[PDB]
Design an enzyme around this catalytic site. Structure first.
Site, PDB file in Angstrom:
ATOM      1  N   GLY B  49       0.882  -1.178   0.000  1.00 21.05           N
ATOM      2  CA  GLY B  49       0.000   0.000   0.000  1.00 21.05           C
ATOM      3  C   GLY B  49       0.906   1.209   0.000  1.00 21.05           C
ATOM      4  O   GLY B  49       2.122   1.100   0.223  1.00 21.05           O
ATOM      5  N   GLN B  54       3.235  10.070   2.084  1.00 25.25           N
ATOM      6  CA  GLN B  54       4.524   9.349   2.171  1.00 25.25           C
ATOM      7  C   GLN B  54       5.524   9.752   1.108  1.00 25.25           C
ATOM      8  O   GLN B  54       6.722   9.598   1.305  1.00 25.25           O
ATOM      9  CB  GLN B  54       4.307   7.864   2.140  1.00 25.25           C
ATOM     10  N   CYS B 102       5.825  -0.516   7.707  1.00 25.37           N
ATOM     11  CA  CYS B 102       5.529   0.799   7.101  1.00 25.37           C
ATOM     12  C   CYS B 102       6.766   1.256   6.350  1.00 25.37           C
ATOM     13  O   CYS B 102       7.883   1.262   6.911  1.00 25.37           O
ATOM     14  CB  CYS B 102       5.124   1.782   8.202  1.00 25.37           C
ATOM     15  N   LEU B 103       6.572   1.707   5.104  1.00 26.33           N
ATOM     16  CA  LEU B 103       7.631   2.311   4.302  1.00 26.33           C
ATOM     17  C   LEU B 103       8.263   3.506   4.999  1.00 26.33           C
ATOM     18  O   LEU B 103       9.411   3.819   4.754  1.00 26.33           O
ATOM     19  CB  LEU B 103       7.113   2.695   2.888  1.00 26.33           C
ATOM     20  N   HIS B 144      -4.551   1.450   7.442  1.00 27.26           N
ATOM     21  CA  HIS B 144      -3.205   1.979   7.575  1.00 27.26           C
ATOM     22  C   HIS B 144      -3.007   3.183   6.672  1.00 27.26           C
ATOM     23  O   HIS B 144      -2.473   4.203   7.084  1.00 27.26           O
ATOM     24  CB  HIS B 144      -2.227   0.855   7.346  1.00 27.26           C
ATOM     25  N   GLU B 145      -3.451   3.024   5.410  1.00 29.18           N
ATOM     26  CA  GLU B 145      -3.310   4.126   4.434  1.00 29.18           C
ATOM     27  C   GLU B 145      -4.211   5.326   4.773  1.00 29.18           C
ATOM     28  O   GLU B 145      -3.757   6.458   4.647  1.00 29.18           O
ATOM     29  CB  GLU B 145      -3.537   3.673   2.988  1.00 29.18           C
ATOM     30  N   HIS B 148      -2.506   7.260   7.358  1.00 28.78           N
ATOM     31  CA  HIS B 148      -1.517   8.153   6.722  1.00 28.78           C
ATOM     32  C   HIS B 148      -2.146   9.458   6.265  1.00 28.78           C
ATOM     33  O   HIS B 148      -1.544  10.539   6.474  1.00 28.78           O
ATOM     34  CB  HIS B 148      -0.751   7.542   5.610  1.00 28.78           C
TER      35      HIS B 148
HETATM   36  O1  LIG Z   1       3.671   2.180   4.858  1.00 29.44           O
HETATM   37  C1  LIG Z   1       2.978   1.710   3.979  1.00 29.44           C
HETATM   38  N1  LIG Z   1       1.871   2.335   3.751  1.00 29.44           N
HETATM   39  O2  LIG Z   1       1.671   3.609   4.171  1.00 29.44           O
HETATM   40  N2  LIG Z   1       3.021   0.506   3.384  1.00 29.44           N
HETATM   41  C2  LIG Z   1       2.846  -0.681   4.257  1.00 29.44           C
HETATM   42  C3  LIG Z   1       1.401  -1.181   4.036  1.00 29.44           C
HETATM   43  C4  LIG Z   1       0.813  -2.157   5.100  1.00 29.44           C
HETATM   44  C5  LIG Z   1      -0.385  -1.858   5.763  1.00 29.44           C
HETATM   45  C6  LIG Z   1      -0.964  -2.766   6.702  1.00 29.44           C
HETATM   46  C7  LIG Z   1      -0.360  -3.998   6.992  1.00 29.44           C
HETATM   47  C8  LIG Z   1       0.827  -4.295   6.327  1.00 29.44           C
HETATM   48  C9  LIG Z   1       1.397  -3.396   5.383  1.00 29.44           C
HETATM   49  C10 LIG Z   1       3.829  -1.761   3.882  1.00 29.44           C
HETATM   50  O3  LIG Z   1       4.701  -2.189   4.824  1.00 29.44           O
HETATM   51  O4  LIG Z   1       3.824  -2.198   2.711  1.00 29.44           O
HETATM   52 ZN   LIG Z   2       2.778   3.167   6.260  1.00 32.35          ZN
END
Ligand SMILES: O=C(NO)N[C@@H](Cc1ccccc1)C(=O)O
Ligand SMILES: [Zn+2]
Ligand SMILES: O=C(NO)N[C@@H](Cc1ccccc1)C(=O)O
Ligand SMILES: [Zn+2]
Lengths: 158, 159
Positions: B49, B54, B102-103, B144-145, B148
């Protein structure tokens, strides 16, 4: 073509320090389109400059585009310049006072700026440029960099 | 397609409430290019996601794109959905707990309680209204998104 919403004073996006543009974004369709949307938005609102944070884009891109228009009837002509990652290398100790407004503060004021600035920046294609501005264009450069650093012109008054 | 820089925890862009996409932006080359750069960034970083804040764009656009990859080797696979101005209209009272990364949070994952089902209304990139029910791991991604977009990181939801 698009005209982007402009953030107003009170919105926290205008108080951030904008992030530099990456090498990946140079010479990309993404970046050309951002710059085009900014340019269109500035034109539609009779701005003589704009900074990306004003359109909710927290990136270091500005346009400097002095031209006579209804909001600045006496402003000098220049070719519009898009600056990526601009940095003011030198401010003149000599100062000038001029009236500014802001697309994000729809209220004008009289602000002290450097008369001359030397600015380094990248073009949308990625070429490194160094160049000097004087007078009204120099003011616009200073106002737009301020936007990148979370500063509105009202905070430079008193 | 361009890969964009990603903001990390601590950076204030991730604390704002992102602005809604405006009507004149719908079905614009601007919005298509934003979504394309988001999508490329997400795939290059092995995300499942991504949210526009971000990538330093304080607008209400997200991508939900569960697929198995090196970061989530057991995720189910769905067709990626780009959502403009998403609004969660119902959260189930039933909860699931799952490990999230999370990224924007390097070197940390944590256990987060999420609703097991969400109903989300959103616009496509062209601007059409769509309402979709998500369950399980896709539902956690949507939540989660949307967090954000509202200035919330998953670390703020732990325990
Ligand atoms: O940080 C981001 N999104 O903002 N991306 C997350 C998305 C996510 C959400 C919920 C559970 C697992 C993963 C990621 O590690 O790919
Ligand atoms: Zn995230
Ligand atoms: O808000 C923006 N720029 O941020 N536009 C300003 C630019 C500006 C700068 C300095 C002096 C006069 C005008 C405007 O009112 O057109
Ligand atoms: Zn301004």
């Amino acid at each position: 073509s698009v005209v982007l919403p402009v953030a107003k004073r009170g919105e926290d996006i205008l108080k951030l320090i904008a992030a530099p543009v990456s090498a990946n974004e140079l010479n990309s369709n993404w970046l050309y389109q951002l710059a085009d949307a900014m340019h269109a938005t500035m034109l539609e609102r009779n701005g003589v400059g704009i900074a990306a944070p004003q359109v909710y884009i927290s990136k270091r891109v500005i346009i400097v585009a002095s031209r006579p228009n209804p909001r600045y009837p006496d402003a000098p002509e220049m070719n519009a310049v898009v600056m990526v990652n601009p940095e003011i290398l030198e401010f003149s100790s000599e100062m000038c006072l001029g009236e500014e407004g802001c697309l994000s503060v729809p209220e004008r004021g009289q602000v002290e700026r450097a008369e001359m600035v030397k600015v380094k920046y990248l073009t949308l294609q990625g070429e490194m440029v160094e160049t000097v501005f004087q007078g009204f264009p120099a003011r616009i450069v200073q106002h737009e960099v301020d936007h990148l650093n979370g500063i509105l012109f009202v905070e430079r008054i008193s």
